[PDB]
Amino acid sequence: SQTQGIQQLLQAEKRAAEKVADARKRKARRLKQAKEEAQMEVEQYRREREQEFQSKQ
Amino acid sequence: ALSDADVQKQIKHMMAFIEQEANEKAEEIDAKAEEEFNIEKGRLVQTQRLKIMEYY
Amino acid sequence: NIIAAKAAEVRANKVNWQSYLQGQMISAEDCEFIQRFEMKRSSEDKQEMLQTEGSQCAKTFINLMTHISKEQTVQYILTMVDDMLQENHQRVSIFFDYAKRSKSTAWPYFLPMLNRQDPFTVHMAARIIAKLAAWGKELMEGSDLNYYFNWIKTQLSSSQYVQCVAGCLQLMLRVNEYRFAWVEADGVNCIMGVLSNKCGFQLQYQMIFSIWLLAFSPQMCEHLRRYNIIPVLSDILQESVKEKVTRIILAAFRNFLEKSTERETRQEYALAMIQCKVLKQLENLEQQKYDDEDISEDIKFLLEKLGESVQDLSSFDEYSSELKSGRLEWSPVHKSEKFWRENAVRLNEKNYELLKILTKLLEVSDDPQVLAVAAHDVGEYVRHYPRGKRVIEQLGGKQLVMNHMHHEDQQVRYNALLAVQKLMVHN
Amino acid sequence: FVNEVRRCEEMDRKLRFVEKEIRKANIPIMDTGENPEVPFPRDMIDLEANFEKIENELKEINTNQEALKRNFLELTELKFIL
Amino acid sequence: IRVWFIKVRKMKAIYHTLNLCNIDVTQKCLIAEVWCPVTDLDSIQFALRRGTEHSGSTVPSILNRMQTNQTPPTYNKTNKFTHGFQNIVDAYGIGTYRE
């Protein structure tokens, strides 16, 4: 009971700090990851439209 | 027992409450992360569509 | 709580897959692979189920649950598999084991489950269906899970099972698409229906968490503002202060009032103030200090925006419209000190026609509350502008307040009394 | 909890104000029962505000009463002058 | 106000009790060493059960009998008559524990 009192707070600070840090790192990575995903999808769309332009020609 | 039994019961309740708080804090922070992903995706979508329209 | 205890008890029940290693009872290769990744502590040992390719890692156990119809053996097997899939931090997480060649039945195979709530297969299926927020797979049919009676019987109503399905629903709403799908279901009405009904703290809390999750989309808040949900939330907030339900009610209100797509829907501020003065609760809570910075920040935000909303409400144009159409009622405009003091000149209408309207209502209005409003407003006008009292006496409105002293309703008598007492200055 | 104690103490001082007003009014003030059950919700703050508002109304009423009495006495002197 | 008065006095007294104690720095709980009769400890546990019922947290309200190195309070029960003699004896001075 006596040690469990600080065990709770150790668990709480551990999990809260780790979730905060994980979410910050997740945002940091997902900024760029969304950028490359969107850019590559956009280049693929550009190639599709260029093929359609050739068909139109 | 009565004393050790009550100590164990208290321990169970306080473990359960920190577990609940853990789930809720985790889900809240994950929701924040999802909202940040969505707004960032919107920024990058419009930035892409600019050049798309220009080229087309 | 009972669900976790029984799950742990079944975990203690070591399943003897070796004796059932014959395929005619339980799958042979899959039971052999149970020996593999037995040291689940090591993720390097979790890699040899990536070696089994998923088809032989518990997908052979899919539709084996029906092959073994005995309650205890299937309970053992499914509870072990479901404990593995309850951890599922890196076990699958990537739609590795997702019934690749049986995708047509991947979602249908839990419709046979979501029964046997006392054997707890309801909850094992409840975690099986929890593959939307992550795990890269999406529910084929909205009616087959949302409208299905896996959380309709339990939501609108033992209570630990309601908690488990509520947590599963919290996870379900993490996705925007199936959040909108759940909106399209009658869960919108059901959550409110049992919000009014009494139940445990955790159940109501998780439901308000679902509301906070729904409050993320700037389209859904405006649709759901047709429902009068804020009074229930404010009642739960004020009557019980658990410091946890308060957090999620606060976050829900913040996100609602933060989307703010259209101003006519941003009027939710004035609506919340009209139906329940939770500004006083915010004062009580901000006087209190909490360690969670989020609570303080959200309280600050809500109080500041409510102050801004009531400041916007304060306008002589609003009051003049209320009186021109006759729609009189107590409101912050009727009690705003700046409106009575700074805009005392505004009460001096052209030919004092608005004050003449007050006189006309002192003679015409028979609703006691409207007459009390008129008397109080006349008193305010006199107090902030004693020179208009002579005009009132010319109009005969003063005589009408003399009449209203003996009104049939005490509040009207009191308002007329105060108005005349202000009219007796220098008389 | 210092703010709670301060609010309760300000309330109590206003209660003594109302008490001395009641003594001036000569009310029997029985105070017989219903006292020791002492319910403990948080809405007591609203009831505090209600009673304090009542005290404010009574104070304003007293000041207005004295003002109107003075005006009455002066104007009655005036009628007797003519 | 006749009803209101002593109940607000109880507000102030109970808030003063909430002041003078160890606000649990770790958790949102309360640790407090309280001198109470040995015989009535079970009665106190019934009171704890009542407070646990009215509250929703359903905490056990742990009661562990402390070991006080400091002075144990000297107390003796009285009735309508011996109270006077006890008052005189204490007016001389209070006796040491278990005298």
XYZ file of C-alpha atoms in Angstrom:
721
model
C 0.000 0.000 0.000
C 2.755 2.436 0.955
C 4.916 1.579 -2.054
C 1.825 1.209 -4.245
C 1.015 4.867 -3.600
C 4.126 5.993 -5.462
C 3.779 3.078 -7.900
C 0.553 4.645 -9.164
C 2.214 8.004 -9.737
C 5.196 6.410 -11.474
C 2.825 4.539 -13.792
C 0.785 7.679 -14.440
C 3.717 9.962 -15.239
C 5.347 7.239 -17.346
C 2.312 6.587 -19.520
C 1.214 10.231 -19.789
C 4.665 11.504 -20.761
C 5.170 8.658 -23.229
C 1.787 9.223 -24.882
C 2.508 12.953 -25.156
C 5.947 12.341 -26.665
C 4.584 9.659 -28.998
C 1.868 11.988 -30.283
C 4.341 14.830 -30.828
C 6.675 12.519 -32.751
C 3.686 11.154 -34.676
C 2.707 14.665 -35.769
C 6.320 15.438 -36.672
C 6.625 12.361 -38.888
C 3.131 12.589 -40.354
C 3.677 16.140 -41.616
C 6.334 14.926 -44.020
C 4.758 11.510 -44.678
C 1.510 13.141 -45.778
C 3.574 15.492 -47.942
C 5.322 12.686 -49.853
C 2.117 10.629 -50.112
C 0.198 13.569 -51.560
C 3.067 14.581 -53.855
C 3.499 11.087 -55.308
C -0.261 10.721 -55.767
C -0.243 14.112 -57.498
C 2.578 13.122 -59.843
C 0.662 9.940 -60.677
C -2.404 12.047 -61.479
C -0.236 14.287 -63.661
C 1.018 11.259 -65.598
C -2.562 10.040 -66.036
C -3.643 13.428 -67.365
C -0.624 13.573 -69.686
C -1.607 10.198 -71.129
C -5.128 11.569 -71.553
C -3.633 14.618 -73.285
C -1.843 12.305 -75.713
C -5.125 10.488 -76.366
C -6.782 13.861 -76.963
C -3.983 14.689 -79.413
C -8.452 -11.255 6.092
C -9.958 -7.842 6.864
C -6.968 -5.481 6.880
C -4.960 -7.070 4.062
C -8.204 -7.744 2.191
C -9.120 -4.056 2.394
C -5.601 -3.084 1.300
C -5.906 -5.367 -1.729
C -9.381 -3.995 -2.498
C -8.083 -0.414 -2.363
C -5.157 -1.421 -4.574
C -7.576 -2.970 -7.061
C -9.761 0.140 -7.190
C -6.796 2.510 -7.616
C -5.178 0.301 -10.289
C -8.545 0.270 -12.074
C -8.891 4.047 -11.840
C -5.392 4.724 -13.164
C -6.122 2.202 -15.933
C -9.276 4.109 -16.860
C -7.407 7.425 -16.762
C -4.721 5.799 -18.907
C -7.222 4.765 -21.561
C -8.845 8.199 -21.559
C -5.620 10.209 -21.708
C -4.300 7.937 -24.457
C -7.472 8.280 -26.526
C -7.585 12.054 -26.014
C -3.993 12.504 -27.158
C -4.617 10.159 -30.099
C -7.634 12.269 -31.066
C -5.463 15.384 -30.928
C -2.917 13.641 -33.152
C -5.656 12.677 -35.624
C -6.922 16.261 -35.815
C -3.381 17.483 -36.456
C -2.986 14.859 -39.192
C -6.244 15.999 -40.799
C -5.443 19.719 -40.806
C -1.929 19.027 -42.105
C -3.397 16.833 -44.840
C -5.659 19.720 -45.829
C -2.725 22.136 -46.045
C -0.734 19.767 -48.217
C -3.776 18.945 -50.371
C -4.370 22.576 -51.306
C -0.633 23.160 -51.797
C -0.597 20.240 -54.243
C -3.774 21.279 -56.056
C -2.224 24.686 -56.763
C 0.538 23.180 -58.908
C -1.902 20.630 -60.354
C -4.147 23.378 -61.717
C -1.159 25.394 -62.935
C 0.300 22.509 -64.945
C -3.071 21.392 -66.301
C -14.665 -5.622 -14.198
C -16.203 -9.098 -14.182
C -15.222 -9.450 -17.847
C -11.540 -8.941 -17.014
C -11.700 -11.350 -14.072
C -13.271 -14.117 -16.153
C -10.806 -13.447 -18.974
C -7.934 -13.824 -16.502
C -9.474 -17.019 -15.133
C -9.675 -18.463 -18.648
C -6.066 -17.362 -19.187
C -5.173 -19.435 -16.124
C -7.029 -22.312 -17.823
C -4.149 -23.575 -19.964
C -5.775 -24.866 -23.146
C -4.550 -28.397 -23.912
C -4.077 -27.879 -27.632
C -1.677 -30.849 -27.657
C -4.440 -33.389 -27.010
C -6.630 -31.520 -29.517
C -3.689 -31.295 -31.939
C -5.652 -33.600 -34.240
C -7.303 -31.445 -36.901
C -10.680 -33.142 -36.449
C -11.179 -31.220 -33.177
C -8.848 -28.197 -33.367
C -6.561 -27.296 -36.266
C -3.305 -29.234 -36.328
C -0.923 -26.729 -37.916
C -2.386 -23.797 -35.971
C -2.206 -25.711 -32.681
C 1.397 -26.548 -33.540
C 2.005 -22.834 -34.103
C 0.515 -22.095 -30.676
C 3.783 -23.606 -29.445
C 5.488 -21.092 -31.707
C 5.419 -17.508 -30.374
C 4.674 -19.014 -26.958
C 7.249 -16.609 -25.501
C 5.021 -13.666 -26.379
C 7.216 -11.339 -24.301
C 9.678 -11.141 -27.219
C 8.624 -9.431 -30.447
C 11.372 -11.393 -32.193
C 9.261 -14.397 -31.199
C 6.197 -12.560 -32.531
C 7.948 -12.568 -35.923
C 7.446 -16.309 -36.424
C 3.723 -15.723 -36.861
C 4.654 -13.436 -39.729
C 6.493 -16.579 -40.800
C 3.197 -18.517 -40.622
C 1.715 -16.015 -43.141
C -1.507 -15.314 -41.228
C -3.602 -17.969 -42.944
C -2.288 -20.494 -40.405
C -2.015 -17.946 -37.553
C -5.591 -17.990 -36.208
C -7.312 -17.697 -39.604
C -7.668 -21.467 -39.516
C -9.194 -20.742 -36.107
C -11.678 -18.492 -37.915
C -14.707 -20.728 -38.602
C -13.152 -23.243 -36.217
C -15.084 -21.516 -33.437
C -18.216 -22.918 -35.093
C -16.515 -26.282 -35.681
C -16.282 -26.758 -31.892
C -19.805 -26.116 -30.606
C -19.092 -27.135 -26.999
C -19.253 -24.049 -24.794
C -16.169 -24.596 -22.640
C -13.624 -25.611 -25.293
C -14.639 -22.876 -27.725
C -14.674 -20.422 -24.815
C -11.100 -21.422 -23.961
C -9.863 -21.132 -27.545
C -11.672 -17.901 -28.403
C -10.742 -16.252 -25.098
C -7.068 -17.084 -25.628
C -7.174 -15.769 -29.206
C -9.089 -12.726 -27.984
C -6.561 -12.019 -25.241
C -3.849 -12.091 -27.905
C -5.964 -9.755 -30.059
C -6.725 -7.621 -26.988
C -3.045 -6.852 -26.533
C -2.566 -6.356 -30.302
C -0.089 -3.515 -29.989
C 2.121 -5.157 -32.623
C 0.581 -8.630 -33.015
C -1.245 -7.718 -36.221
C -1.826 -3.940 -36.405
C -1.218 -3.873 -40.194
C -4.047 -6.100 -41.448
C -1.656 -9.032 -41.456
C -4.258 -11.583 -40.272
C -7.468 -10.334 -41.885
C -8.882 -13.337 -43.813
C -7.120 -12.437 -47.047
C -8.916 -15.028 -49.188
C -12.080 -14.795 -47.047
C -12.483 -11.011 -47.047
C -16.087 -11.584 -48.118
C -16.676 -13.272 -44.737
C -14.101 -11.291 -42.727
C -16.784 -9.013 -41.323
C -19.665 -11.529 -41.580
C -17.945 -14.099 -39.349
C -18.660 -12.140 -36.138
C -22.382 -11.869 -36.883
C -22.585 -15.468 -35.675
C -20.697 -14.072 -32.674
C -22.061 -11.017 -30.771
C -24.254 -13.474 -28.863
C -23.561 -15.563 -25.741
C -22.979 -12.521 -23.557
C -22.666 -14.661 -20.409
C -20.025 -16.935 -21.985
C -18.612 -13.480 -22.942
C -18.376 -14.172 -26.683
C -20.150 -10.819 -27.068
C -17.004 -9.095 -25.810
C -14.534 -11.249 -27.720
C -16.485 -10.345 -30.846
C -16.573 -6.748 -29.587
C -12.775 -6.710 -29.737
C -12.778 -8.571 -33.072
C -14.918 -5.780 -34.543
C -12.494 -3.195 -33.096
C -10.461 -3.024 -36.302
C -11.511 0.411 -37.625
C -9.595 3.057 -35.639
C -6.453 1.158 -36.659
C -5.607 -2.273 -38.125
C -6.400 -1.034 -41.661
C -9.781 -2.633 -42.326
C -13.254 -1.149 -42.699
C -16.764 -2.382 -41.931
C -18.554 -3.471 -45.099
C -22.095 -2.889 -43.783
C -23.055 -0.195 -41.301
C -26.300 -1.879 -40.279
C -24.515 -5.153 -39.509
C -22.644 -3.639 -36.538
C -24.160 -0.248 -35.657
C -27.831 -1.242 -35.862
C -26.948 -4.785 -34.775
C -27.870 -5.604 -31.185
C -24.284 -5.820 -29.936
C -24.548 -2.368 -28.352
C -28.257 -1.562 -28.809
C -29.502 -3.962 -26.130
C -26.744 -2.913 -23.703
C -26.575 0.835 -24.412
C -30.323 1.323 -23.826
C -30.680 -0.447 -20.495
C -24.614 -6.260 -16.830
C -23.414 -2.655 -16.602
C -19.817 -3.830 -17.051
C -20.891 -5.202 -20.424
C -22.341 -1.782 -21.236
C -18.951 -0.316 -20.307
C -17.107 -2.745 -22.581
C -19.327 -2.047 -25.581
C -19.088 1.680 -24.796
C -15.300 1.484 -24.971
C -15.594 -0.427 -28.232
C -17.867 2.361 -29.501
C -15.350 4.992 -28.395
C -12.769 3.172 -30.500
C -15.288 2.864 -33.348
C -15.903 6.624 -33.466
C -12.160 7.346 -33.752
C -12.653 7.013 -37.537
C -14.369 9.933 -39.259
C -16.137 7.882 -41.940
C -17.701 5.395 -39.544
C -18.360 8.210 -37.101
C -20.616 9.592 -39.834
C -21.973 6.085 -40.420
C -22.853 5.848 -36.722
C -24.519 9.250 -37.076
C -26.627 7.823 -39.899
C -27.724 5.155 -37.423
C -30.145 5.849 -34.577
C -27.243 5.800 -32.111
C -27.576 9.598 -32.133
C -30.935 9.228 -30.409
C -29.954 6.191 -28.320
C -26.957 7.857 -26.661
C -29.171 10.771 -25.586
C -31.952 8.402 -24.534
C -29.746 6.637 -22.016
C -27.948 9.880 -21.141
C -31.259 10.981 -19.656
C -31.613 7.560 -18.016
C -29.514 7.007 -14.903
C -26.499 4.690 -14.994
C -22.958 4.388 -13.674
C -20.399 7.170 -13.761
C -18.127 5.409 -16.246
C -20.987 4.699 -18.668
C -22.144 8.320 -18.791
C -18.525 9.442 -19.014
C -17.798 7.199 -22.001
C -20.972 8.364 -23.708
C -19.890 11.978 -23.278
C -16.530 10.858 -24.677
C -18.398 9.603 -27.741
C -20.044 13.033 -27.913
C -16.623 14.700 -27.759
C -15.425 12.415 -30.562
C -18.492 13.338 -32.627
C -17.684 16.999 -31.979
C -14.531 16.805 -34.151
C -16.163 17.346 -37.545
C -17.183 20.950 -38.396
C -20.193 19.510 -40.261
C -21.562 17.181 -37.590
C -21.728 19.761 -34.795
C -24.045 21.916 -36.882
C -26.295 18.971 -37.729
C -26.433 17.753 -34.119
C -27.174 21.236 -32.768
C -30.795 20.495 -33.688
C -30.747 18.124 -30.687
C -31.000 19.828 -27.285
C -28.152 17.908 -25.675
C -26.402 20.730 -23.773
C -28.940 20.835 -20.878
C -28.323 17.164 -20.052
C -24.557 17.674 -20.112
C -24.776 20.766 -17.903
C -27.023 18.908 -15.451
C -24.572 16.005 -15.213
C -21.729 18.515 -14.858
C -23.259 20.595 -12.075
C -25.041 17.933 -10.022
C -21.942 15.707 -9.744
C -18.365 17.006 -9.777
C -16.175 13.914 -10.214
C -13.272 15.818 -11.861
C -13.433 13.281 -14.726
C -16.918 13.659 -16.212
C -16.215 17.371 -15.849
C -13.143 17.022 -18.064
C -14.973 15.348 -20.928
C -18.042 17.586 -20.699
C -15.659 20.550 -20.818
C -13.780 19.126 -23.810
C -17.023 18.355 -25.656
C -18.320 21.888 -25.119
C -14.963 23.288 -26.223
C -14.884 21.300 -29.457
C -18.532 22.039 -30.277
C -18.031 25.759 -29.743
C -14.663 25.632 -31.559
C -15.864 24.263 -34.906
C -18.077 27.313 -35.495
C -18.801 26.922 -39.207
C -21.710 29.413 -39.221
C -22.618 32.209 -36.803
C -26.284 31.219 -36.482
C -24.961 27.892 -35.183
C -22.311 29.657 -33.066
C -25.308 31.015 -31.136
C -24.845 27.802 -29.105
C -23.086 30.112 -26.613
C -26.253 32.110 -25.953
C -28.288 28.891 -26.066
C -26.188 27.301 -23.320
C -26.446 30.492 -21.267
C -30.219 30.603 -21.796
C -30.925 27.008 -20.790
C -28.461 26.824 -17.870
C -26.187 29.488 -16.394
C -23.030 27.358 -16.331
C -20.977 30.561 -16.187
C -21.351 30.295 -12.413
C -20.035 26.727 -12.534
C -17.078 27.958 -14.589
C -16.401 30.592 -11.927
C -16.527 27.886 -9.253
C -14.118 25.653 -11.169
C -11.620 28.380 -12.097
C -11.459 29.475 -8.469
C -10.443 25.863 -7.892
C -7.013 24.926 -9.255
C -6.384 21.641 -11.074
C -3.069 20.107 -12.089
C -4.315 19.282 -15.603
C -3.407 22.352 -17.650
C -5.963 21.243 -20.244
C -8.850 21.704 -17.796
C -7.759 25.249 -16.965
C -7.170 26.175 -20.606
C -10.549 24.827 -21.726
C -12.360 26.561 -18.857
C -10.607 29.817 -19.747
C -11.582 29.396 -23.397
C -15.229 28.619 -22.685
C -15.610 31.449 -20.174
C -13.931 33.956 -22.503
C -16.062 32.993 -25.495
C -19.216 33.076 -23.365
C -18.238 36.562 -22.238
C -17.776 37.509 -25.883
C -21.157 36.003 -26.785
C -23.015 37.875 -24.046
C -21.171 41.059 -25.036
C -22.422 40.495 -28.584
C -25.935 39.927 -27.227
C -25.764 43.334 -25.539
C -27.002 45.712 -28.239
C -29.752 48.317 -28.299
C -30.825 47.048 -31.726
C -31.670 43.651 -30.238
C -33.712 45.157 -27.393
C -35.527 47.554 -29.714
C -36.480 44.663 -31.991
C -37.704 42.657 -28.983
C -39.941 45.549 -27.969
C -41.072 46.430 -31.503
C -42.382 42.911 -32.088
C -43.400 42.595 -28.426
C -41.326 39.464 -27.728
C -40.359 40.457 -24.181
C -38.401 38.176 -21.849
C -35.633 38.431 -19.270
C -32.221 38.216 -20.929
C -28.655 39.537 -20.560
C -29.643 42.534 -22.694
C -32.387 43.345 -20.181
C -29.768 43.217 -17.381
C -26.616 44.575 -19.063
C -25.357 47.569 -17.089
C -23.699 49.149 -20.132
C -26.974 48.908 -22.055
C -28.794 50.809 -19.311
C -26.016 53.344 -18.649
C -24.034 53.947 -21.843
C -27.059 53.413 -24.115
C -29.435 55.457 -21.956
C -29.395 57.962 -24.824
C -30.457 55.151 -27.164
C -33.513 54.609 -24.964
C -34.324 58.235 -25.856
C -35.907 57.186 -29.136
C -37.125 59.480 -31.883
C -40.136 61.137 -30.229
C -39.461 58.508 -27.522
C -41.502 56.000 -29.535
C -39.821 53.029 -27.850
C -40.687 54.446 -24.431
C -44.194 55.013 -25.760
C -44.148 51.321 -26.690
C -43.255 50.607 -23.068
C -46.317 52.651 -22.064
C -48.475 50.833 -24.624
C -47.322 47.529 -23.137
C -47.990 48.758 -19.607
C -51.578 49.160 -20.827
C -51.749 46.222 -23.258
C -49.507 43.336 -22.189
C -51.269 40.957 -19.803
C -48.460 38.410 -19.473
C -47.142 39.101 -15.932
C -43.506 38.487 -16.901
C -43.699 40.918 -19.827
C -45.186 43.569 -17.536
C -42.455 42.981 -14.952
C -39.911 43.397 -17.751
C -41.561 46.653 -18.813
C -41.636 47.998 -15.254
C -37.983 47.120 -14.628
C -36.925 48.661 -17.938
C -38.874 51.841 -17.165
C -37.178 52.005 -13.774
C -33.757 51.570 -15.367
C -34.526 54.266 -17.936
C -35.636 56.682 -15.215
C -32.613 55.942 -13.023
C -30.122 56.439 -15.858
C -32.152 59.350 -17.301
C -34.232 61.264 -14.738
C -35.226 63.849 -17.354
C -37.325 61.272 -19.216
C -39.535 60.769 -16.168
C -41.335 64.027 -16.955
C -41.972 62.700 -20.464
C -43.285 59.479 -18.915
C -45.647 61.453 -16.677
C -46.875 63.308 -19.760
C -47.393 59.947 -21.488
C -49.225 58.625 -18.422
C -46.884 55.649 -18.072
C -46.094 56.740 -14.523
C -49.801 56.380 -13.723
C -49.648 52.897 -15.237
C -46.860 51.977 -12.816
C -48.984 53.370 -9.974
C -51.621 50.917 -11.192
C -49.091 48.065 -11.460
C -48.071 48.454 -7.813
C -51.190 46.409 -6.968
C -50.705 43.885 -9.779
C -52.010 40.355 -9.284
C -48.483 38.850 -9.368
C -45.936 39.738 -6.689
C -43.005 40.063 -9.098
C -44.869 42.665 -11.163
C -45.746 44.514 -7.953
C -42.071 44.540 -6.951
C -40.863 45.742 -10.353
C -43.475 48.509 -10.434
C -42.507 49.421 -6.869
C -38.842 49.815 -7.799
C -39.742 51.737 -10.955
C -41.877 54.221 -9.029
C -39.273 54.502 -6.266
C -36.825 55.597 -8.943
C -39.550 57.919 -10.278
C -39.859 59.562 -6.822
C -36.372 61.097 -6.991
C -36.642 64.859 -6.413
C -40.398 64.472 -5.835
C -9.986 25.556 0.811
C -9.315 29.126 1.971
C -11.718 30.529 -0.623
C -14.478 28.236 0.634
C -13.950 29.421 4.210
C -13.846 33.069 3.139
C -17.093 32.730 1.189
C -18.775 30.977 4.117
C -17.527 33.659 6.516
C -18.753 36.528 4.341
C -22.076 34.716 4.110
C -22.160 34.378 7.896
C -21.460 38.077 8.418
C -24.349 38.873 6.084
C -26.391 36.374 8.103
C -25.645 38.366 11.252
C -26.727 41.503 9.396
C -30.050 39.829 8.599
C -30.188 38.591 12.196
C -29.956 42.084 13.665
C -32.521 43.309 11.136
C -34.817 40.523 12.354
C -34.205 41.532 15.974
C -35.207 45.069 15.046
C -38.308 43.474 13.490
C -39.081 41.346 16.597
C -39.700 37.943 14.991
C -40.109 34.931 17.354
C -37.201 33.069 15.614
C -38.112 29.601 16.883
C -35.228 27.603 15.317
C -36.762 24.309 16.444
C -35.813 21.527 14.027
C -34.739 20.395 10.535
C -31.303 21.796 11.451
C -28.991 18.838 12.265
C -29.446 16.788 9.068
C -27.067 19.228 7.284
C -27.243 18.216 3.596
C -23.995 18.651 1.657
C -24.429 19.475 -2.042
C -22.582 22.160 -4.033
C -25.744 24.170 -4.769
C -25.353 25.810 -1.344
C -23.343 28.508 -3.143
C -26.443 29.424 -5.147
C -28.503 29.585 -1.950
C -25.814 31.787 -0.404
C -26.085 34.115 -3.390
C -29.878 34.089 -3.028
C -29.837 35.127 0.626
C -27.154 37.748 -0.047
C -29.299 39.110 -2.880
C -32.211 39.300 -0.437
C -30.003 41.256 1.969
C -28.998 43.623 -0.840
C -32.666 44.193 -1.677
C -33.418 44.925 1.975
C -30.527 47.399 2.234
C -31.575 49.209 -0.943
C -35.160 49.213 0.328
C -34.033 50.796 3.598
C -32.055 53.544 1.865
C -34.958 54.272 -0.483
C -37.316 54.256 2.505
C -35.271 56.910 4.285
C -35.010 59.001 1.114
C -38.763 58.862 0.484
C -39.499 59.593 4.144
C -37.306 62.695 4.033
C -38.991 63.826 0.814
C -42.426 63.240 2.354
C -41.578 65.214 5.489
C -40.155 68.134 3.504
C -43.103 68.304 1.111
C -45.579 68.030 3.998
C -43.840 70.916 5.718
C -44.315 72.684 2.390
C -48.065 72.025 2.275
C -48.389 73.345 5.825
C -46.403 76.448 4.821
C -49.142 77.443 2.368
C -32.129 31.783 7.968
C -33.026 29.858 11.117
C -32.417 26.634 9.202
C -29.564 28.171 7.195
C -27.467 29.309 10.159
C -26.102 26.213 11.872
C -25.788 24.406 8.552
C -23.467 27.131 7.251
C -21.612 26.850 10.550
C -21.220 23.157 9.726
C -19.988 24.182 6.268
C -17.259 26.250 7.881
C -16.351 23.566 10.426
C -16.146 20.775 7.847
C -14.085 22.957 5.520
C -11.744 23.664 8.432
C -11.443 19.906 8.891
C -10.673 19.562 5.174
C -7.922 22.126 5.723
C -6.067 20.603 8.686
C -4.831 17.299 7.258
C -2.403 15.770 4.741
C -3.755 16.597 1.302
C -2.458 13.575 -0.597
C 0.220 15.046 -2.848
C 0.403 11.821 -4.857
C -3.262 10.931 -5.446
C -6.650 12.629 -5.096
C -7.197 10.951 -1.728
C -6.734 11.855 1.948
C -4.450 10.485 4.667
C -5.285 11.650 8.186
C -4.246 10.388 11.616
C -7.338 10.583 13.824
C -7.644 9.828 17.542
C -10.796 7.799 18.194
C -11.985 5.227 20.763
C -10.736 1.665 20.400
C -14.165 0.176 21.112
C -15.905 2.410 18.575
C -13.524 1.623 15.687
C -16.178 -0.647 14.189
C -18.760 2.135 14.572
C -16.337 4.344 12.668
C -16.129 1.673 9.974
C -19.930 1.758 9.678
C -19.651 5.530 9.265
C -17.023 4.923 6.576
C -19.373 2.503 4.826
C -22.095 5.166 4.896
C -19.762 7.758 3.393
C -18.652 5.173 0.840
C -22.277 4.490 -0.109
C -23.184 8.156 -0.567
C -20.039 8.714 -2.641
C -19.665 7.010 -6.005
C -15.967 6.137 -5.866
C -16.792 3.164 -3.582
C -13.407 3.387 -1.844
C -12.780 0.890 1.010
C -11.857 3.707 3.431
C -8.850 1.880 4.855
C -8.675 1.886 8.668
C -5.207 0.937 9.945
C -4.554 1.342 13.662
C -1.523 3.626 13.933
C 1.359 3.120 16.377
C 1.819 6.502 18.045
C 5.176 7.079 19.709
C 3.777 10.413 20.933
C 1.448 10.874 23.890
C -1.767 8.837 23.801
C -4.562 11.197 24.906
C -5.769 10.727 28.477
C -9.555 10.375 28.417
C -12.198 9.024 30.774
C -15.931 8.715 30.252
C -18.348 10.447 32.605
C -22.083 10.846 33.208
C -24.343 13.586 34.542
C -22.775 13.370 38.033
C -19.098 12.325 37.969
C -18.438 14.979 35.307
C -18.052 17.534 38.094
C -15.481 15.514 40.018
C -13.613 14.806 36.789
C -13.626 18.543 36.072
C -12.135 19.255 39.505
C -9.460 16.573 39.109
C -8.525 18.015 35.720
C -8.665 21.535 37.170
C -5.738 20.456 39.296
C -4.280 18.978 36.116
C -4.725 16.098 33.684
C -3.134 12.808 34.643
C -0.617 10.911 32.572
C -1.858 8.178 30.240
C -3.123 5.081 32.078
C -2.800 6.605 35.547
